[PDB]
Ligand binder design. Sequence first.
Ligand SMILES: Nc1ncnc2c1ncn2[C@@H]1O[C@H](COP(=O)(O)OP(=O)(O)OP(=O)(O)O)[C@@H](O)[C@H]1O
Ligand SMILES: O=P(O)(O)O[C@@H]1[C@@H](O)[C@H](CO)[C@@H](OP(=O)(O)O)[C@H](OP(=O)(O)O)[C@H]1O
Ligand SMILES: [Mn+2]
Length: 270
Amino acid sequence: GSHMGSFKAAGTSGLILKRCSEPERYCLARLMADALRGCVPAFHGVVERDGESYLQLQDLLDGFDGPCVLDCKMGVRTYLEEELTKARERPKLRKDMYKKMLAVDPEAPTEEEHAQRAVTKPRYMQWREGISSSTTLGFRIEGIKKADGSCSTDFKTTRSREQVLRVFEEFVQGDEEVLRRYLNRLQQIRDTLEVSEFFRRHEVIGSSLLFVHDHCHRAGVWLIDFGKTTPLPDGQILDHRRPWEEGNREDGYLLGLDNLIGILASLAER
Ligand SMILES: Nc1ncnc2c1ncn2[C@@H]1O[C@H](COP(=O)(O)OP(=O)(O)OP(=O)(O)O)[C@@H](O)[C@H]1O
Ligand SMILES: O=P(O)(O)O[C@@H]1[C@@H](O)[C@H](CO)[C@@H](OP(=O)(O)O)[C@H](OP(=O)(O)O)[C@H]1O
Ligand SMILES: [Mn+2]
């Protein structure tokens, strides 16, 4: 298997290039020497391709024969707290996000948003959290790429525990071995997160769990996308379960993982 926005084919077999960003490069470097080393794609350093910097990553699809892929965005919160400060002091009115909001729900915007034809990023991202499962379950399905070539990103209103279960039910297509392997992996990831020095000291926002399986029953799960993962002020740590309140920088990451494990455990007994 192979993946090939921000991605480019690598020179070397089994690798992929992702546009380098400073938060993400800092994170992947730290993760290679963390408990979470095996839970993330291998990071091999940075390369230049036509004057641009790329992260050299493990292509997670490379082991698989016609991979099925599900991207699950983790956390009750999907934006940095500084976005709220910027939206109050010096707001950037996003005409595009008003349109994207209008497209999903023409009646979601306020009187004033309608008049602006524009919303703030945090307002848009909080709305996306509330009509998806992000706010109540601490994760949401972002998309699926199936082995039949078909892909879907039509999950913005996938919200209830039972709606999420039905997406995973269709994704695994009755393969008990794949589901057992996903649950074993998620249990071991949760154990690793609970002991990780990196995880206790970082606010993990905008990251995904990438589920990958094939018709040969190979199955894996990795954490990806550390573009918005930021170190806490030294000596401060998060519990990753307690509710977010502006200033505490809580992400609900483990509330999301606990709920996700519960849903797959439910599916396995159906
Ligand atoms: N290391 C990897 N190997 C294989 N596929 C990958 C890898 N990393 C990412 N992908 C694929 O690329 C998709 C997007 O990756 P990622 O979320 O890291 O990018 P992004 O541009 O930061 O996206 P966004 O910030 O909008 O969530 C994943 O859902 C997955 O299909
Ligand atoms: O998925 P959407 O289109 O509803 O919403 C997009 C969301 O998925 C992206 C991932 O979080 C988010 O980027 P980040 O700043 O969070 O990395 C992107 O913001 P910008 O348009 O400002 O680039 C949103 O529009
Ligand atoms: Mn992402």
